From Swiss-Prot:
Effect of N45S: Found in lattice corneal dystrophy; unclassified form; late-onset
Function of the molecule: Plays a role in cell adhesion. May play a role in cell-collagen interactions.
Protein name per UniProt: Transforming growth factor-beta-induced protein ig-h3
PTM field: Gamma-carboxylation is controversial. Gamma-carboxyglutamated; gamma-carboxyglutamate residues are formed by vitamin K dependent carboxylation; these residues may be required for binding to calcium. According to a more recent report, does not contain vitamin K-dependent gamma-carboxyglutamate residues. The EMI domain contains 2 expected intradomain disulfide bridges (Cys-49-Cys85 and Cys-84-Cys-97) and one unusual interdomain disulfide bridge to the second FAS1 domain (Cys-74-Cys-339). This arrangement violates the predicted disulfide bridge pattern of an EMI domain.
Documented effect of changing G95V: In lattice corneal dystrophy; unclassified form
Tissue-level expression: Highly expressed in the corneal epithelium. Expressed in heart, placenta, lung, liver, skeletal muscle, kidney and pancreas.
Binding partners and assembly: Binds to type I, II, and IV collagens.
Disease as annotated in the protein's UniProt record: Corneal dystrophy, epithelial basement membrane: A bilateral anterior corneal dystrophy characterized by grayish epithelial fingerprint lines, geographic map-like lines, and dots (or microcysts) on slit-lamp examination. Pathologic studies show abnormal, redundant basement membrane and intraepithelial lacunae filled with cellular debris. Corneal dystrophy, Groenouw type 1: A rare form of stromal corneal dystrophy characterized by multiple small deposits in the superficial central corneal stroma, and progressive visual impairment.
Part of the whole protein covered: 502 to 634 of 683
Amino acid sequence: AGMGTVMDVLKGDNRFSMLVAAIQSAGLTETLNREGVYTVFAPTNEAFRALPPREWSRLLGDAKELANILKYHIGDEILVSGGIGALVRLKSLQGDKLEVSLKNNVVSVNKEPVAEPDIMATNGVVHVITNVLQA
């Protein structure tokens, strides 16, 4: 039912179901399956639809290629809904910044609007995005 970490939170949701399989193909389970602090901006299945098949066929074809972008969806510590201010930048795993902003009750990350912030896991927090994130 999603009782676990940022990994299991996705494992137990129908909208993140195919996401799990990508993370799986990436084999970075231990990253998000271990305890710590993380902020995972989780792209839904229609978000997988918002990317050119070429770039994605690269990710699903190569684990570290997939992991490359997938790690950028994950912040280095927990930035919950109550921490979302005007614009707060949080670090990520890929190495760049998550551009989180709150404008008129609408949360945005990396210039992409969030659908539902603050789905907590045991090792961090998850935020539903309907688009995938790229630098």
